[PDB]
Amino acid sequence: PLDVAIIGGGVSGTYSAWRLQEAQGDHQRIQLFEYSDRIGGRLFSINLPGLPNVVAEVGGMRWMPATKDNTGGHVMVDKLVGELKLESKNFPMGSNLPDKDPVGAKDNLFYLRGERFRLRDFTEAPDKIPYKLAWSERGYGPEDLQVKVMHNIYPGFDKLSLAEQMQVKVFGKEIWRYGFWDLLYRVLSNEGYQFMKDAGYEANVANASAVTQLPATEYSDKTVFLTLKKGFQALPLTLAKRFAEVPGGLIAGEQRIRMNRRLASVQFSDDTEYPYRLHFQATRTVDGKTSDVPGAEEIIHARQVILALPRRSLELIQSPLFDDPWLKENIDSVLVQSAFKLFLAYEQPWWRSQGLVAGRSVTDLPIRQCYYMGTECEQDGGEKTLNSLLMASYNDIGTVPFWKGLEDGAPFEGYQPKSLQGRIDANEVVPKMQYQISEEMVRIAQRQVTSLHDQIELPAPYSAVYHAWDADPFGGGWHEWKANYRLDLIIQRMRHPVQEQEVYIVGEAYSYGQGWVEGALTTAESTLQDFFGLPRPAWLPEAYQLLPAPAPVDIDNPPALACTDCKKTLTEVTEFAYTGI
Amino acid sequence: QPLDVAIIGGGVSGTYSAWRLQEAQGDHQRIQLFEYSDRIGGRLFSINLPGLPNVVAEVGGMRWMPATKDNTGGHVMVDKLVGELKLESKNFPMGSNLPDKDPVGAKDNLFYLRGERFRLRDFTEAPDKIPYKLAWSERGYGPEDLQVKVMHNIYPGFDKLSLAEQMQVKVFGKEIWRYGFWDLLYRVLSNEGYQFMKDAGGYEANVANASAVTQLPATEYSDKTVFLTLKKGFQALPLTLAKRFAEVPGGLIAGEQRIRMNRRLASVQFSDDTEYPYRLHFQATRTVDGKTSDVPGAEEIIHARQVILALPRRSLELIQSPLFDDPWLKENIDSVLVQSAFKLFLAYEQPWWRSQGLVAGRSVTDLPIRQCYYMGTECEQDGGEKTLNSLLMASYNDIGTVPFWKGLEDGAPFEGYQPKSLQGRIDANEVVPKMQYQISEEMVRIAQRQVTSLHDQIELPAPYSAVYHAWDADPFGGGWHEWKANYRLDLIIQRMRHPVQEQEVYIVGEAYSYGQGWVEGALTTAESTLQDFFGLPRPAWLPEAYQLLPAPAPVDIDNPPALACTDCKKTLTEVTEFAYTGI
Ligand SMILES: Cc1cc2nc3c(=O)[nH]c(=O)nc-3n(C[C@H](O)[C@H](O)[C@H](O)COP(=O)(O)OP(=O)(O)OC[C@H]3O[C@@H](n4cnc5c(N)ncnc54)[C@H](O)[C@@H]3O)c2cc1C
């Protein structure tokens, strides 16, 4: 049988397991179940040929470290990597060249409405921006314009607590009853509305609750970001290994994890002890592509279930539990957004020849978002080769676009790099992913990159990797709270969605840090404390609030928000306006 | 007693299906139509907003292309049954008839893209005003005109080829149907000229990446193209059918039991009756003010010889049956992209647009309304009221989800205001119709706000009535269907009439027709099934000239014989003169 049946080989599920077994594994039977042959889930890191030291993270890349106060930042991720003694690098968003005056990303590229400019042109030469925006909006970068909108709406939102940010109202409605665009088109011009869009991930928020998506002003090159050296996927992997490595235990390391298992159902049994018939199902991973194996059955019993799952995953499992109208109505509370990623690998970082180093360039061409990821010979004690990496698609948007189109015709073989002419074969240069990139896609993707960089012919790529997250079991890669949904409360309850039942969900989807690993961890850690009873770890400060304090249930006519330092705020809000004037 | 046939779904497809049958093989077999709701007509919906009793606000279907004199072209099926069932037809105007001397048509209709205002004429009159970086070659063509330049640029005459030949036309070493629509255009157009067409042309945010073989000869929507909507509203046809069905004298079953509404099919099952291998387990469904929800009661089971499913994609997807397990039918129900449809109507006591030299047609914008249509004025209608009450239709965007027309569906409801023209004739609680969806005090205010801007106005007269509707809800989960790419529509158009042969189940609907988003598409699919699989003949009102469905190319599109071109001496000549227009 089973006491604790964790379902999810993600940061959530890998974290859930480690903590418990490394605590009460000797006193409890704990088994993590995964649907693929890979631990990591939406975390995924691959080194490509020629680039042993340039990690192509198909999943999560960066986290925001903790502060001194250890109240701000992605504390859980910075400190967990702490205890797990995994290595960190500064995930670079701009140029540190020159070091007299780093041009950050100021000199990074922009290519909208068939006109090229820079991030510095926004402020330095707003005539160059080809958006007929209003006079009040002219002279702000888009990241700076978001903050204008916020304060316009209310000064200080950012510094409010979710509890308070829920009582905040705009033009009559609470702000969380506004989609992110049903707001923008009321406080911005349509030429500001269309603008921000084109120049965010078109998706951006697809009308995500405005209380979450408004203070999204940490995309700056001014904020810090750290990446795992061995790839982000090394955290959930290292979480799995240490799970089995627990000396001692009612179950043995070897039989502690169970891969290629798709939990198809959670039927209710009489067995008081284990009242959950967990109908799993065998699968097979053939070059990442996971597909069912017949035979049916595999009915393990459990006392407690932990679903380290996203929404679709929870959609797909059949239970009567889900027929509980709260869970039925609030499973919908979030929004699957499909994410798309395309890496291209050159013997050359040709971008360095045109001022660009790291960060991102944006365009109205289907590639939308090119990133500059690094060169091998640069990477600390790496191989001595100018082989460098370009994550030229970040584009995420639902439905059938141009990325979910050209992924057919003929596959891409590439070419063998000099470096690898005495080391690897041309049948392995382009790796074997769940999604095999085409000759076609790469040709066009190259054609687009070249236009973005205002060149005529760029050095061709040898290796590349397409991926996508529009496929079950994920539906999408990121989740975003819908409008008219009390995210404040759902964050608290989704952990124990029905009281009577010992069924638990934990993930980035039903967390405050949505589209972050910090989200998945927090939900996990908060739930192990408030329910499973595990005490707060040593590496996790007393300070760091895991999940934010909600508002009340009655916000029908709340007591007003008593401002404190209104002074500083308005002082600031004005001073901010002179940076566009 | 059991049923020989069960035409499930009361769409224009279903209603046509049961009619002809009973008409012919109805004394010969037990025919019964099954409806989900309190209303026949399906997507075809025709409400008369109060004060506008003669200005039909077709929420669903509206118009149809008249038949040509050779009868091989035009919505032939629709335009001959509109005569046969004898239904009143008026012109659907896309342009202004005034001035009688030199009719401007849609030329003067408005455009507001990228915060700059122009008209359809300003394309061919003064491109200088288009605020798009269209390359030299492309500068000087209207959205319609451009699509045709591209088409031609591909295989000159693509519009002239039968589906068979079209499918075989490759472009840049790929089958045209392997490309989507945009995927193609983002290789023939400048990325502005791409964006530009995505902001104006035909529908709206729609024009989704769909098989190029369907969406490239989609230029029909011009201001030279004639079009007609039924006087009584398009819902008239699939009701006169629904009536006429139960009105056939010769029948085993009387008219009172023939049309069984408020019956939603949940399971098609293989029974034991070797004569009725179809145990249909229905469920009771109640309709209060457009919102039909289930009555848990009891799953009523009726035995059927065959079930002619007149359902679109979700509607089908919603039945639990081992029949959908058939590997073909599993992977060929995803042959079509579901795309939602929204729509707002606003009623005014003055057609303020006339004051601004716009009559009928549409106007395009980078604002969320995206589109807007001027319908008509009650008293302009033939023997209408003596009111200046008029109708503006809109919210005709068309996109996946969470857009900006679903972002204002909540708040408080719009009650409107008793016009002077409906004083003591109807009450301010009854001015704004109660529909499935109730347009909010908020959605009206924003819509109007936006409409104002579109028309470069300071303030417009507030509307008195307003209805919002959507087709993003099951049992449809989408307005109209568009063929995906790397699919063989030609074949599926044939084999969706009978997905499984051994089994006597037939699916009919525009959802898998050539006329997708057209009433023709649903009539055609039904008729060509009645004829082939129910041996019903060509009726008197249908010419033999009109080929119902298009020629399926061979399965061997591997390296077939090359299409011997025709009057190039003509073709290439029309292709070259067509490029002198834009210069
Ligand atoms: C493009 C992209 C970029 C990102 N970048 C960042 C970033 O820079 N920084 C950051 O912090 N975060 C980032 N994220 C977010 C991060 O990758 C995820 O949110 C996180 O990995 C989710 O962890 P989880 O355990 O909650 O869920 P998952 O990792 O999705 O865990 C679900 C697991 O359960 C398995 N499963 C599903 N169904 C079943 C079933 N029926 N039975 C058994 N197992 C099942 C899945 O295969 C998977 O292993 C990014 C995400 C994307 C898509």
Ligand SMILES: Cc1cc2nc3c(=O)[nH]c(=O)nc-3n(C[C@H](O)[C@H](O)[C@H](O)COP(=O)(O)OP(=O)(O)OC[C@H]3O[C@@H](n4cnc5c(N)ncnc54)[C@H](O)[C@@H]3O)c2cc1C
């Ligand atoms: C916004 C819009 C505008 C359009 N404009 C035009 C136009 O201008 N001109 C034109 O020619 N065409 C137009 N069309 C197309 C037109 O609506 C279609 O041709 C037609 O309505 C579809 O007929 P159908 O038989 O395929 O299915 P539908 O008409 O969609 O009928 C489906 C029926 O199935 C029923 N049903 C669903 N589930 C069940 C169940 N479980 N059991 C039983 N019954 C069930 C539904 O209640 C419904 O009655 C438009 C469509 C839309 C969405």
